[model samples]
Target: ELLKPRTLADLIRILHELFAGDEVNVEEVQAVLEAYESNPAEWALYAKFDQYRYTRNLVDQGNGKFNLMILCWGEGHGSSIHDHTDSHCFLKLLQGNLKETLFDWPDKKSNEMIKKSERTLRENQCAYINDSIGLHRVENVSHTEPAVSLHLYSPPFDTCHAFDQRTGHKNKVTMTFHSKFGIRTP
Candidate 1:
């Protein structure tokens, strides 16, 4: 199989072709994410601009299996540290730089959200997350240019949880949703 996808559409085609049956291609999804985790620059071409300097394209078949998406994040923009309760996800940075952090269960309800993993993914870098270690977040640390990437999730990504990392007099909040009017933080 080709390690590199020619375009965002090409990536989608590859995913669809690989996982074309009733079953969701969890392993293939992992492979694609792993490839991106290893190389992100190759996936940056699909970045689109939207809210807070981000871009995303989705392939939803509504049959419990989805293709993939290309995401672009500008400076000062990123997804919160969170997770989809039972979803498996993978991300590959196609351009710029990104910082990723993973949290672990300290006890039961409390999470020792320590810097368990940290990496500055450049072009063509990729990462994977399953139910066991799916709690994590990512951001673009670039002060100037925007960061571009690709992400593939099985069963499709719908809802997610956000975290507030501040403690002791630190005013922190988890954003629940992005408002339609814009500039309205949830």
Candidate 2:
């Protein structure tokens, strides 16, 4: 009865098994996100931080079904209002705290985003969202401490857009990894 996986590898293995089916039941994925008490000591090899921006590190690229990653947020660091267009994104807080901001979808030409709601996520909390759910931004709420989070993306995507409210511009961002397989990348 080895169900609860504390290590990142074990977690990924179970995720692969779950996604193996032709049709994935997202509820089960969310349930896995809820049940596991992940131990960063074993999986957070990508916990290194950069003062300017948050860092994204790859854990398992997945079996062509999804991807798993570790995101490290430096103090005062935040992401722009980003879209989750064609995939499902899930976040699991591992350390410190993060502030998540939900924004109304910007009109195509205007790119204006109205802040709809906001909340702070504490360690061990999990959240899920997709493009239609609304654009979102995440920040390290703690001005003094850094934050770390685990993420899963189903039908993994390599490119996405970030919206600029003030300038009414959309920026295309190509996702990159700062580390892979628990090893730092050069």
Candidate 3:
């Protein structure tokens, strides 16, 4: 059996109906989960981690209360340390392995920074975040395989802060309405 969302507009419409508001209902999240469960293969796309748009799969669903991003990761590709200001997030690994490191804001901030904790996301795994513990990064740990994940952001993530690992410089990065995967290295 095959499942095809009539159009991107239709997908977004369903998402909006389920998410945008003062509170998000469980049924909305279930809708997206069910879509992926039924038609996981159709959501493939290329995820841009830098200049390279590596082969991956992605689907966008949002209802304003929160946004959902389903990502498939190619080997050796992953995100750098970054965060979405004022947003809460979580991810469920559907397949393969992913490595994530969580960072904390240092007092008397300077270029020198350190992470407070770290974790590895493996197959059938999930992680959570909120405004207090929202700063982190993730990447595909497989040297030759791929990883798949589903991401959910509360109140939806429209803009983000991208960081430069070298100088410890941070820049506000604009995200497309549905996709927010990229990194810049110099």
Candidate 4:
């Protein structure tokens, strides 16, 4: 398969087609996303950052079953410990650097979590997460440089659970889009 998607839209369409089948696995999605890593210029338009916080720009919402997004992380910005609920996620770091920490729960009903692994992802690297993984946090590695990543989610979410690492408390928060198709929303 010649995996050269012309643009972010083209990538989304290819993913939609790949996922339309009866079996859509993480390996397949990760492989496809990795293929896109070498061609960052194709989706360069989606890479935009905010100084105050990380920006998640919706690139394409595919058939209500999947979504493609460009996530830009400003200096010192990162996500809270969170779970994907039931969705599968693939993340490709298109520019700059990011640190991802994965956690493991000894008990799901309790707030006990153990640090599983921490990885630093540079440009062109990729990561994967799903419901089976307990929780994770992604942050920009450099305080002076911003990071940009492309994320694709299966069965796009409206709400996801954020975990309080210290208190073991979880809260459901609504997801928001910074922009869609070059239109910013306040």
Candidate 5:
């Protein structure tokens, strides 16, 4: 059987329906994301990265209820271990391969983290995280091939804390965009 193509608009509509209610859970969001079929048209939203750093481009800020982005990861690139603050986050691997590691704080006041779980996701696989959980780190599994993922956050956050696994140090940082819509910028 052939899978029907799913467009970006289709995704947006589904998300709007899912988030229309006041209460949302990770399981429901993950199921919707897992069922999403990717379309070639959605790939146009991504822009190539010149540096090894990951690029996060804004796709939509949905009526102040959600924010969506297309994240491009360069070869061997990953994110720092971080928490999503108060927002609930959903990530769907769109291309290439990605490895996500989930961590938990051993003590509330301590910066140390113990690895709770880790998994690799391929194209079309989805994962989720929320403020109630611990921190997580996401990396491109391949050293040569770049990866791309779509992320949706409810009650979008502007700042979050990042943890240094090696040194057990944490720092707060403000998030920024590499591009808006389809336009790339320095």
Candidate 6:
């Protein structure tokens, strides 16, 4: 039978159990996110959207093995093409449709990015990514509604590279959270 979690807290509990060892069961963790499709209203308290930018808020740190957060993208908000370092990242859409565009790694000499593919994830859908799979840019393509998603990164990382879509000029970014443990940070 599939694991059925009723709330975000249930997800945390199930995830902590899944991540409690040196090695994790990848399919189980993915299944947890796949199974949990609670209503947005049930977890709206953790989703705070910014007027002009997307927001990332912490939900669980997962004892350093993994970190779980909710990201809110205001209408028209999107991210630069970027890599996830060595972390395993997963996204479970909770609100509005989201677009995930995959790009081939830039050439070292020419620094040019090639678009590989693209897909849109509707509410309750999930996507997984890693540097090995190449770079990507995620966005809320909605013109009228905001988007919210639950993200889980294993062995959480802070530094990553963002590539210019045209030039593929790379720059390092030290990412930050807008809030932690339900409190605003900046």
TM-score of each predicted structure versus truth: 0.69, 0.92, 0.66, 0.88, 0.88, 0.95
Task: Tell how far residue 104 is off in model 1, in angstroms.
Answer: 0.8
Question: Whole-model Cα lDDT per candidate?
Answer: 0.59, 0.83, 0.59, 0.80, 0.80, 0.87
lDDT of 6 by residue, 80-176 (tens): 9999988889899988889999998888766567789999988887788888899999999899999999999988987889999878889999999
CA shift at 144, candidate 3, in angstroms? 1.1
Give the per-residue lDDT digits (tens) of candidate 3, residues 1-186. 124335434545665655545765544454444354322344344233332433322354354466666665678877767886776576767667888878764444456557677888766455776657746778886787677776767777667776665445677886653244222112
Which residues of candidate 4, in runs, are more than 4 Å off?
1-7, 38-41, 106-112
Q: Which 10-residue window of candidate 4 scores lowest in summed lDDT? A: 105-114
**Two-way lDDT contest, 1 vs 6, winner:** 6
Q: Which ranges of candidate 6 are over 4 A from the true structure?
A: none
Q: Model 4, 124-150: lDDT tens per residue?
A: 777899868778989996968888898
RMSD of 5: 3.1
What's model 2's overall lDDT? Answer: 0.83
Candidate 3 vs. true structure, TM-score: 0.66
Report backbone clashes per prediction. 17, 0, 8, 0, 0, 0
What's every prediction's RMSD, in angstroms?
5.9, 1.9, 6.5, 2.2, 3.1, 1.4
Candidate 2 Cα outliers beyond 4 Å, as residue runs? 109-111
Ranking by TM-score: 6, 2, 4, 5, 1, 3
Q: What is candidate 3's CA lDDT for residue 145?
A: 69
**Candidate 3 runs further than 4 Å off:** 1-21, 24-60, 177-186
lDDT digits (tens) for residues 42-121 of candidate 5? 66666557476898888877866888888889888999999998899999988888999998744546455767899898
Looking at candidate 2, the ten consecutive residues that score lowest on lDDT are 1-10
Ten residues in sequence with the least summed lDDT for candidate 6:
106-115
Best by TM-score: 6
Candidate 5 residues lying further than 4 Å off, grouped into runs, are 1-5, 106-112
